[PDB]
Amino acid sequence: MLRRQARERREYLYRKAQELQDSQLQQKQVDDEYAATSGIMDPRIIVTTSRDPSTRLSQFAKEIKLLFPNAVRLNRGNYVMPNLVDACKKSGTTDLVVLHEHRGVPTSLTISHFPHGPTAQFSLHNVVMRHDIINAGNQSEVNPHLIFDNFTTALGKRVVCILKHLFNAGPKKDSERVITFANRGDFISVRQHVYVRTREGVEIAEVGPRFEMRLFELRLGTLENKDADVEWQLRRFIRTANKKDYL
Amino acid sequence: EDYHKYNRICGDIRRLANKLSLLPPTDPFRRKHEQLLLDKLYAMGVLTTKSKISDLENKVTVSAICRRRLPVIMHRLKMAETIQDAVKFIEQGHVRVGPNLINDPAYLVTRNMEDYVTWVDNSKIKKTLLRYRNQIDDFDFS
């Protein structure tokens, strides 16, 4: 087995390089990792948390589970990261979601795509969980419709590709549930709504949660491989950071 | 070293794709038949990556076939320092590809079998490995 992953990682590091060159020559479609299964096999997602999670992070993890139709929540009690990724790769999962917190406040969200990446890390701001809503009720778990707004750059398209395939392909035309990721100065606003088509328009009601997610790291490998080559990273101490936009 | 046999393989692949170039492009058999060739060469390991037809015309070479040879492959895997030496163990019967040992140097390993190559369990060559690492476990007989 260890000869599998070593050989396939070398093939992947090459394939991304060829894809990068081909795109640059085109500068002068769906990404390789997702091209094989794009719209063929419905994604398989595991959502987990850091060691010894607080009650809220467990609640927030449950909310993220409800967001993705094919997500399953897994307790991270003493699990070792190589064991976690290896065990999940055995089960055939497509993506792994790991959540971090600070005093019961969700701070981060990391997404790793199996079997060979990429890994995207995000920071959560202004998080509002549905447990802050009284008499909210239960969610609808149909396949959502997806709305992506203001993703223009190549990195923006990359973030679109990662987020698109967390959901099932081919939602029904009349599904009442819509999930939106709106980019505004690299701070992607995530909202969930249920709509009804009226005789003179459409009215929408949000289900929650609200949270703003900003990319700060994107590596070519699973989240375990700390040595994985970095495809893109956010620079903050640059003098132009206060006004620079990437997505 | 004589490469007449592989040279026959390379050309025979070239003649096949050429005559397929002669058939009408829209013929389903032509498109079907080609895809079997691209798959077969990929399976053998002659093609490191999936390719198109004109790529088969030039990618296929004697060196690609020789790279797939078991004497060559264990050298890349660092099992043997030298190729003639590598030919010795396989002729000395200390090498297994999958559940079957191969005593013939001329065997090339396919992409899928490329990795299951290893020593036979009771090979004295393997004991010298684990003895230095001091990980020799007599229960595994190795």
């Binding site: 590091l13 090459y14 390089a17 | 490191t48 990556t49 790279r67 890349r76």
Partner: peptide, 22 residues
């Protein structure tokens, strides 16, 4: 390598020497 390196395996080697040079 006696008979040359594959295209994937040439690429990784080039990466390794660059890191080694650094």
């Amino acid at each position: 390598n006696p008979y040359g390196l594959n295209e994937v395996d040439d690429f990784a080697s080039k990466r390794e020497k660059v890191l080694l040079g650094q």
